[PDB]
Amino acid sequence: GSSGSSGENVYGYLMKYTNLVTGWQYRFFVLNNEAGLLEYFVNEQSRNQKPRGTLQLAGAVISPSDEDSHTFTVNAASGEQYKLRATDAKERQHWVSRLQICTQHHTEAIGKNNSGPSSG
């Protein structure tokens, strides 16, 4: 594989499945390498605003579909899959890969539980 020495925030407009009637709906997404949580907002103008929903990656699995050029799903250890669509066929490999690494780099990092008997 490739060691990602540097780590930058991954974000991009993806299409999330809201329902059958409506189908797909373009939306903004922002990955959190620090925390390790995948959030999403109605749009980019809703960055500082409260997020609509969050999905845990730690212990998740990425399954890139083959139906359409740009398509992929983000599973979750708990039991929740996400349906998104990359901007293009080139950006698809970016998200899938990036995430596939965030889900592991984290799930693996999670170990010794150091509550912290000392703060401030």
Swiss-Prot record:
Every PH domain range: 8-104
Subcellular compartments: Late endosome membrane; Golgi apparatus, trans-Golgi network membrane
Tissue specificity remark: Present at highest levels in ovary, testis, kidney, liver, stomach, brain, and adipose tissue. Strong expression (at protein level) in epithelial cells of kidney tubules, testicular tubules, caecum, and skin. Present at low levels in subcutaneous and visceral adipose tissue (at protein level).
Chain positions found as Phosphotyrosine: Y11
Subunit structure: Heterodimer with OSBPL9.
Domain notes: The PH domain binds phosphoinositides.
Stated name of the protein: Oxysterol-binding protein-related protein 11
Natural source organism: Homo sapiens
